[PDB]
Amino acid sequence: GPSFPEPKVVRSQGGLLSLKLSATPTPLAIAGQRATLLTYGGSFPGPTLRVRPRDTVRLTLENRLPEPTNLHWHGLPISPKVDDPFLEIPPGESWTYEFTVPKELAGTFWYHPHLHGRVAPQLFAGLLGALVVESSLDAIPELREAEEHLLVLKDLALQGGRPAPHTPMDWMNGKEGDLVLVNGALRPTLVAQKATLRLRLLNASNARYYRLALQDHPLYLIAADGGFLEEPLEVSELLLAPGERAEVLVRLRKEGRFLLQALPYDRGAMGMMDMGGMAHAMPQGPSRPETLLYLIAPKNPKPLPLPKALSPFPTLPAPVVTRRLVLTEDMMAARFFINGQVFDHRRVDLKGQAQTVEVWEVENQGDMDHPFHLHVHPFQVLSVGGRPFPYRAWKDVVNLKAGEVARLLVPLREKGRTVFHCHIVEHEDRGMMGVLEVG
């Protein structure tokens, strides 16, 4: 096959993507060894669904797992009656998700389980896939003539030919694995045929962070989680927290081999130590550096000019309310809280009005990084940690380092009951989630 592995693509046909997927334990070969994972569509990652605005998506999920499951259409501004975080599909049963892709939408999204208390083991075991909303902006020459690839960043650990079980420390920290994979492959080689690459990036890991840097090159950020930026933004590195997406242009500068690496990053994971005075918690410190892929440039590379503009970001109406959501931790109990409470599916925590804009101040009073995710209602990050955000784009996950406050502009879209939660999914399962009702 092609030197660079990527998930198989299923495209809408005539305005309709109608597809039956099964969530099933699947024997397969991965990173050179046989293992049984939990997959959608018999593959890890699951198939990439490629659609365009106004398409109808009709996805029937058949649950062939021994436990109940559901889907979260991560990042899609669709009704929470469809993207239903409280629905349960029992083993052996099926459910059809049907929605229309919104007209003003573009980017890389993804799908994965969201059954409270079971997310971390199901996601860790392999249940995820990407969804791409293609845009008319893809036709501008500076993008159309680039070589496009999806990079699904997701780690794994195997024990006895199956995903490794969660330990108590895994529930506290979020589980990371030793196999640090791209598109389910171990350190693949991308032999570029064009000098400009357009890379769609997805962090589909439970908890691992990717401090991305390409040797000898900057990256040009062109999209965040849920839409394009207004113009390309040059960065020397790009941190992708769990659940986040980005799109970058790479302008290969000379012939050669260049490593794409996940550089050392300390997200605050904790270990234990006994030095003669009772066991005490001690920081794990930064992650070890990882090579994600080998990028081979073509001969005599002459990259395309960058696009001068992408998509204007909407001018939002003045907000009508400010909310303050404080994140805290009880590490030794592996319990995690929002405004001092754990999730209760019967309890509505916030009540807002559709078509108004809110300011959300999310404050991390813990010591770990927490990537905060809101379903249904994409937001504009105004500032994090006292620093203004350097671009305007739609996001749906925002990473908070210890002590940091993020200020978000949240337009409320579809009416109904939805959730917000930490996207270290172990923390969600262990309580760090709340309920928003929009009326």
> In this structure, is the dihedral angle defined by the CA atoms of residues 364, 369, 372 and 378, taken in order, positive or negative?
positive
In angstroms, what is the minimal distance from the CB of 294 to Cu ion?
Answer: 29
The length of the chain, given as a count of residues: 439
Q: Between 370 and 407, whose beta carbon lies closer to Cu ion?
A: 370
Interface with Cu ion, residue 211, by CB under 5 A: no
Q: What is the DSSP letter of 312?
A: P
280: how many CB neighbours lie within 10 A of its CB? Answer: 10
At closest approach, how far in Å is the CB of 205 from Cu ion? 11
Shortest distance (Å) from residue 372 CB to Cu ion? 8
Query: Measured from the CB of residue 321, what is the shortest distance to Cu ion in angstroms?
Result: 22
Q: Is 421 annotated as a binding residue?
A: yes
Give me the helices (H) in 206-290, please.
Answer: none
345 annotated as a binding-site residue: no
- Residue 243 or 431 having the CB closest to Cu ion: 243
Nearer to Cu ion, 250 or 406 (CB): 406
Place of tokens 């195997």: 158
The Cα 53–Cα 140 span in angstroms is 17
Is 422 annotated to bind ligand? yes
Q: In the beta sheet, which residues pair with residue 381? A: 408
Distance of alpha carbon 127 from alpha carbon 39, whole angstroms: 5
Q: Is 217 annotated as a binding residue?
A: no
- Residue number with CB closer to Cu ion (72 or 149): 72
Taking the least distance from each CB to Cu ion, the nearer of 112 and 251 is: 112
Contact 39, 204 (CB under 8 A): no
Q: How far is the CB of 16 from Cu ion (least distance, A)?
A: 25
Among 250, 427, 429, 430, binds Cu ion (CB under 5 A): 427
Residue closer to Cu ion by CB (options 149, 370) is 370
Residue 348 and residue 300: Cα distance in Å, rounded?
59
**Burial grade of 236 (CB within 10 A; 0-12, 13-18, 19 or more):** exposed
Residues touching Cu ion, count (CB under 5 A):
8
By rule CB under 5 A, what string of x and - marks binding of each residue 84-123 to Cu ion?
Answer: ------------------------------x---------
Answer for which of 424, 435, 436, 438 binds Cu ion (CB under 5 A) is: 424
Among 422, 435, 436, 438, binds Cu ion (CB under 5 A): 422
Select from 17-25, 234-242, 293-301, 421-429 the region that touches Cu ion (CB under 5 A): 421-429
Closest CB 329 distance from Cu ion, rounded Å: 8
Decide: 394 and 225 in contact? Cβ < 8 Å: yes
Q: Among 47, 59, 74, 129, which residue interacts with Cu ion (rule: CB under 5 A)?
A: 74
Q: Report, in Å, the least distance between residue 242 CB and Cu ion.
A: 8
For residues 210, 214, 218 and 224, what is the CA-based torsion angle, rounded to 10 degrees?
Answer: -30
- Residue 99: strand pairing partners: 57
Selected from 47, 129, 243, 378, the binder of Cu ion by CB under 5 A is 243
Q: Return the residue matching tokens 């598109």.
A: 183
Output 130 or 297, the one with its CB closest to Cu ion. Answer: 130
Determine contact, residues 145/304, Cβ cutoff 8 Å.
Answer: yes
Q: Residue 375 pairs with which residues in a beta bridge? A: none
CA atoms within 13 A on the CB side of 165: 3
Gaps in the chain (C to N distance exceeding 2.5 A) after: none
Shortest Å distance, C-beta 338 to Cu ion: 10
- Closer CB to Cu ion, residue 51 or residue 334? 334
Given a contact cutoff of 8 angstroms between Cβ atoms, the answer to whether 195 and 303 are in contact is yes
14 or 168: whose CB is closer to Cu ion? Answer: 168
Min dist. Cβ of residue 70 to Cu ion (A) = 11
Select from 292, 143, 153, 336 the least CA-distant residue to 222: 143
User: Using the rule CB under 5 A, which residue among 118, 198, 370, 395 binds Cu ion?
Assistant: 370
Cα distance between residue 176 and residue 270, in whole Å = 12
Annotated binding-site members: 72, 74, 112, 114, 280, 370, 373, 375, 421-423, 427
Annotated binding-site members for Cu(2+): 72, 74, 112, 114, 280, 370, 373, 375, 421-423, 427
Residues in contact with Cu ion by CB under 5 A are: 72, 74, 114, 243, 370, 422, 424, 427
